[PDB]
């Protein structure tokens, strides 16, 4: 494993964060590759991409994703002003992160319909400190662990629905886990 933090590896921004519980390891490989292995973890997020992201990036990902419990595989990032945490979810484990969330529409992109949702985090950690902020979700109906995400299709559909993004902060393909197990090996470009 590498130490939790952010930086650059083989030309790609990476972020790896965990809550200190144990049970997760993250490694950076050649090019845009990263791996994650976890067993009875706590909370974590790790992956590779860009800092800052853009609003018209076509992100390509490929590999394997084998969750055993609660985990997501997504294009994941933040905006500032307004502060937003966003996800384009290509696959997940035992929990669909949109469960119980208000549906804000649909968008068709890259071979599947996605359902769009907004949720809110109240006094939770963020890139600027503890804050209350919205989360935007596009959840792919047809699950996969390789493909291409035309981010503009999502960001445009979100804007159409009133879900405004500010200036982009980081933008990665990420494996997120919440007290689960699994393995993943993903290459980004």
From Swiss-Prot:
List the lineage, top down. Answer: Eukaryota, Fungi, Dikarya, Ascomycota, Pezizomycotina
GO cellular component labels:
extracellular region
- The reaction(s) this protein catalyses: Endohydrolysis of (1->4)-beta-D-xylosidic linkages in xylans
Q: Could you say which protein family the record assigns here? A: Belongs to the glycosyl hydrolase 11 (cellulase G) family.
Q: Which cysteines link up through disulfide bonds?
A: none
Stimuli inducing this protein: Induced by D-xylose, dependent on the cellulase and xylanase regulator xyr1. Repressed by glucose through negative regulation by the crabon catabolite repressor cre1.
Q: Which gene encodes it?
A: xyn2
* Active-site feature positions: 85, 176
Record keywords: Mitochondrion included? Answer: no
Q: What is the purpose of this protein?
A: Glycoside hydrolase involved in the hydrolysis of xylan, a major plant cell wall hemicellulose made up of 1,4-beta-linked D-xylopyranose residues. Catalyzes the endohydrolysis of the main-chain 1,4-beta-glycosidic bonds connecting the xylose subunits yielding various xylooligosaccharides and xylose. The catalysis proceeds by a double-displacement reaction mechanism with a putative covalent glycosyl-enzyme intermediate, with retention of the anomeric configuration. Produces xylobiose and xylose as the main degradation products.
Q: Where does substrate bind?
A: 72, 76, 87, 121, 125, 135, 170
What pathway, per the record?
Glycan degradation; xylan degradation
| Residue positions the entry lists as glycosylated | 37, 60
- The residue ranges of the GH11 domain are 1-188
- For this entry, the protein name equals Endo-1,4-beta-xylanase 2
Question: Carries keyword Ribosomal protein?
Answer: no
């Amino acid at each position: 494993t590498i130490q939790p933090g952010t930086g650059y590896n083989n030309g790609y921004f990476y972020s790896y964060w965990n809550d200190g519980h144990g049970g997760v390891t993250y490694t950076n490989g050649p090019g845009g590759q990263f791996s994650v292995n976890w067993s009875n973890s706590g909370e974590f997020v790790g992956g590779k991409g860009w800092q800052p992201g853009t609003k018209n990036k076509v992100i390509n990902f490929s590999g394997s994703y084998n969750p055993n419990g609660n985990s997501y595989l997504s294009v994941y990032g933040w905006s500032r002003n307004p502060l937003i945490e966003y996800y384009i979810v290509e696959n997940f484990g035992t929990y669909n992160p949109s469960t119980g969330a208000t549906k804000l529409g649909e968008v068709t992109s890259d071979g599947s319909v996605y359902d769009i949702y907004r949720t809110q985090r109240v006094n939770q950690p963020s890139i600027i400190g503890t804050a209350t902020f919205y989360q935007y979700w596009s959840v792919r109906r047809n699950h996969r662990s390789s493909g291409s995400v035309n981010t503009a299709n999502h960001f445009n559909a979100w804007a159409q629905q009133g879900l405004t993004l500010g200036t982009m902060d980081y933008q990665i393909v990420a494996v997120q886990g919440y007290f689960s197990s699994g393995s993943a090996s993903i290459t980004v470009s």
